[PDB]
Amino acid sequence: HMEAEVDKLELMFQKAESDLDYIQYRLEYEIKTNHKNPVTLLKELSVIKSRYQTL
Amino acid sequence: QTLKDDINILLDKARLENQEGIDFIKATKVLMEKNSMDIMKIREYFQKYG
């Protein structure tokens, strides 16, 4: 009974997961297919914002 | 941008201070020659008087 209801809830969550999983899978695909980045840009900006005050 | 402004702006004040410096030493080294004659002219005078 409620066990059945819960079986549903679990089923839904599992869907939501594979939903999310797909969205991700796609983004990764669009990403792979094309060819800077903010990551190294921060490191560079700290190297400058530092040796400016040093200098 | 503001960072590249400051980092530029500073560079300017240093370009200057190397200048406002690099001609002082010469601007001073000309008053040196002037005060150097002006003593040698006073000295040559006081030895003789005439």
From Swiss-Prot, chain A:
Domain of life: Eukaryota
Locations listed in the record: Cytoplasm, Cytoskeleton, Spindle; Chromosome, Centromere, Kinetochore
Quaternary data: Component of the SKA1 complex, composed of SKA1, SKA2 and SKA3. Forms a heterodimer with SKA1; the heterodimer interacting with SKA3. The core SKA1 complex is composed of 2 SKA1-SKA2 heterodimers, each heterodimer interacting with a molecule of the SKA3 homodimer. The core SKA1 complex associates with microtubules and forms oligomeric assemblies. Interacts directly with SKA1. Binds directly to microtubules; but with a much lower affinity than SKA1. May interact with NR3C1; the relevance of such interaction remains unclear in vivo.
Family membership: Belongs to the SKA2 family.
Main function: Component of the SKA1 complex, a microtubule-binding subcomplex of the outer kinetochore that is essential for proper chromosome segregation. Required for timely anaphase onset during mitosis, when chromosomes undergo bipolar attachment on spindle microtubules leading to silencing of the spindle checkpoint. The SKA1 complex is a direct component of the kinetochore-microtubule interface and directly associates with microtubules as oligomeric assemblies. The complex facilitates the processive movement of microspheres along a microtubule in a depolymerization-coupled manner.
Protein name as annotated: Spindle and kinetochore-associated protein 2
Provenance organism: Homo sapiens (Human)
Taxonomic path: Eukaryota, Metazoa, Chordata, Craniata, Vertebrata
Residues of the full protein shown: 1 to 60 of 121
Swiss-Prot record, chain B:
Coiled-coil residue spans: none
Signal peptide per UniProt: none
Compartments, record wording: Cytoplasm, Cytoskeleton, Spindle; Chromosome, Centromere, Kinetochore
Protein task: Component of the SKA1 complex, a microtubule-binding subcomplex of the outer kinetochore that is essential for proper chromosome segregation. The SKA1 complex is a direct component of the kinetochore-microtubule interface and directly associates with microtubules as oligomeric assemblies. The complex facilitates the processive movement of microspheres along a microtubule in a depolymerization-coupled manner. In the complex, it mediates the microtubule-stimulated oligomerization.
Subunit details: Component of the SKA1 complex, composed of SKA1, SKA2 and SKA3. The core SKA1 complex is composed of 2 SKA1-SKA2 heterodimers, each heterodimer interacting with a molecule of the SKA3 homodimer. The core SKA1 complex associates with microtubules and forms oligomeric assemblies. Interacts with SKA1; the interaction is direct.
Family: Belongs to the SKA3 family.
Protein name stated in the entry: Spindle and kinetochore-associated protein 3
The encoding gene: SKA3
